Design an enzyme around this catalytic site. Structure first.
Site, PDB file in Angstrom:
ATOM      1  CE  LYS A  43      -3.544  -2.604  -0.233  1.00 25.37           C
ATOM      2  NZ  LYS A  43      -4.167  -2.658  -1.676  1.00 25.37           N
ATOM      3  CB  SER A  44       4.440   1.863  -0.246  1.00 23.97           C
ATOM      4  OG  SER A  44       4.362   1.522   0.850  1.00 23.97           O
ATOM      5  CB  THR A  46       3.290  -1.469  -5.874  1.00 23.21           C
ATOM      6  OG1 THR A  46       3.276  -1.800  -4.441  1.00 23.21           O
ATOM      7  CG2 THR A  46       3.975  -2.543  -6.814  1.00 23.21           C
ATOM      8  CG  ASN A  47      -1.596   1.191  -7.840  1.00 21.57           C
ATOM      9  OD1 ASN A  47      -0.934   2.242  -7.576  1.00 21.57           O
ATOM     10  ND2 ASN A  47      -3.137   1.188  -7.619  1.00 21.57           N
ATOM     11  CD1 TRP A  48       1.219   6.798 -11.106  1.00 19.45           C
ATOM     12  CD2 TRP A  48       1.326   7.740  -9.038  1.00 19.45           C
ATOM     13  NE1 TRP A  48       1.262   8.145 -11.216  1.00 19.45           N
ATOM     14  CE2 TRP A  48       1.236   8.798 -10.172  1.00 19.45           C
ATOM     15  CE3 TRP A  48       0.986   8.156  -7.778  1.00 19.45           C
ATOM     16  CZ2 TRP A  48       1.302   9.845  -9.809  1.00 19.45           C
ATOM     17  CZ3 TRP A  48       1.188   9.568  -7.511  1.00 19.45           C
ATOM     18  CH2 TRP A  48       1.207  10.464  -8.484  1.00 19.45           C
ATOM     19  CG  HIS A  98       4.464  -6.276  -1.298  1.00 16.53           C
ATOM     20  ND1 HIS A  98       4.406  -5.112  -1.902  1.00 16.53           N
ATOM     21  CD2 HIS A  98       3.319  -6.700  -1.956  1.00 16.53           C
ATOM     22  CE1 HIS A  98       3.377  -4.683  -2.422  1.00 16.53           C
ATOM     23  NE2 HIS A  98       2.594  -5.814  -2.441  1.00 16.53           N
ATOM     24  CB  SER A 128      -3.870   2.943   2.379  1.00 17.84           C
ATOM     25  OG  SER A 128      -4.030   1.875   1.217  1.00 17.84           O
ATOM     26  CE1 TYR A 183       0.753   9.057  -2.675  1.00 17.00           C
ATOM     27  CE2 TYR A 183       1.193   6.951  -3.678  1.00 17.00           C
ATOM     28  CZ  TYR A 183       0.311   8.046  -3.357  1.00 17.00           C
ATOM     29  OH  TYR A 183      -0.946   8.195  -3.926  1.00 17.00           O
ATOM     30  NE  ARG A 246     -15.821   3.757   3.093  1.00 23.59           N
ATOM     31  CZ  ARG A 246     -15.928   3.166   4.374  1.00 23.59           C
ATOM     32  NH1 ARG A 246     -15.461   2.083   4.601  1.00 23.59           N
ATOM     33  NH2 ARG A 246     -16.394   4.045   5.528  1.00 23.59           N
ATOM     34  N   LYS A 247     -14.174   6.208  -1.501  1.00 27.75           N
ATOM     35  CA  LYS A 247     -13.390   7.384  -1.334  1.00 27.75           C
ATOM     36  C   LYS A 247     -12.957   7.794  -0.019  1.00 27.75           C
ATOM     37  N   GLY A 248     -11.907   8.570   0.195  1.00 25.07           N
ATOM     38  CA  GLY A 248     -11.289   9.219   1.290  1.00 25.07           C
ATOM     39  C   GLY A 248     -10.848   8.168   2.393  1.00 25.07           C
TER      40      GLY A 248
END
Ligand SMILES: C[C@]12CC[C@H](O)CC1=CC[C@@H]1[C@@H]2CC[C@]2(C)C(=O)CC[C@@H]12
Length: 284
Positions: A43-44, A46-48, A98, A128, A183, A246-248
């Site tokens: 959750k740091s 990775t996908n971006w 990871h 996250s 990040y 979901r957001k936030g």
């Protein structure tokens, strides 16, 4: 087997992992000098980072990141599916991990393979992971925010303690085949960060090719791609598919920590990270 696979003192997910593959990962997997690897605590971001690397290799053309699923174009070496596909893939290879340093392939340390390590503010990583993991079936769930908060700082969460993961890898920071990124710099100046990456990997991009990569790698563009935001996970592995979007709840730590939790976390961070230079971490 109490809702997680325990291996060498670290907890792993229940579906998609086996004790023997994890052992072969360390003892037998072979790393090559032409491999390129993304390393992160979960959750740091990775996908971006994976989306940007696919775009540099394809000179800006994007049906690839819009056509193929992240776990296929940048597989996790420690998982069954990933280990299988990689072991039969032609160079050059692009993949992800990871794992903390004590469990990573022995073969790597005798190589010239390039690695990019990405870290993020641990307050946003905690939030996250709280919302993401409590929404997955077959995984041990916390009884409350307070209970998860305590698991995270003691280290009894997926992939171990965030403080131990960072201490293990930092000593490799000045080696030639290793690039350290945050990040926060990626989000505040994406263009300057893409140039740091193109220099380290040693490839050259033509002017109109860099223009296209810049257009397709924005934060906004990233969050809306179904191939990269995890919203392709089937109804069989998720508890409620509807809040996947979901957001936030994928950062914004100030909307979730109480004032006393923030003052106590500040003291804990100073104590545990005192043996490293403070200015290596760009967040208050
Ligand atoms: C893909 C992902 C989610 C994204 C992580 O970066 C890597 C990862 C590891 C194990 C997977 C999990 C999604 C949810 C899964 C499928 C479970 O419920 C158990 C195994 C879990």
């Amino acid at each position: 087997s109490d809702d997680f696979l325990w291996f060498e003192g670290i907890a792993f997910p229940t579906m998609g992992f086996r004790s023997e593959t994890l052992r072969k990962v360390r003892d037998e997997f072979v790393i090559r000098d032409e491999d390129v690897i993304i390393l992160t605590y979960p959750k740091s971001g990775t996908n971006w980072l994976a989306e940007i690397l696919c775009l540099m290799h394809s000179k800006g053309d994007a049906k690839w990141i819009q056509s193929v699923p992240i776990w296929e174009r940048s597989p996790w070496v420690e998982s069954e599916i990933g280990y299988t596909a990689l072991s039969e893939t032609e160079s050059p290879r692009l993949f992800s991990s990871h794992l903390p340093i004590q469990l990573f392939p022995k073969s790597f340390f005798s190589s010239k393979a390039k690695v990019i390590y990405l870290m993020r503010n641990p307050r946003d990583v905690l939030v996250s992971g709280y919302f993401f993991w409590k929404n997955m079936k077959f995984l041990k769930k916390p009884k409350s925010w307070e209970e998860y908060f305590e698991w995270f700082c003691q280290g009894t969460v997926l992939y171990g303690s965030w403080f131990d993961h960072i201490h293990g890898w930092m000593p490799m920071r000045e080696e030639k085949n290793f690039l350290l990124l945050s990040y926060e710099e990626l989000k505040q100046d994406t263009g300057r960060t893409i140039e740091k990456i193109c220099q380290f990997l040693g490839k050259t991009l033509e002017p109109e090719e860099l223009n296209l990569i810049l257009k397709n790698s924005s934060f906004q563009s990233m969050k809306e791609n179904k191939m990269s935001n995890y919203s392709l996970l089937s109804v069989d592995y998720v508890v409620d598919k509807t809040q996947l979007l979901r957001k936030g709840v994928s950062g914004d730590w100030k909307n979730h920590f109480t004032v006393a939790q923030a003052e106590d976390f500040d003291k804990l961070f100073q104590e545990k990270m005192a043996d490293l230079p403070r200015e290596l971490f760009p967040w208050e």
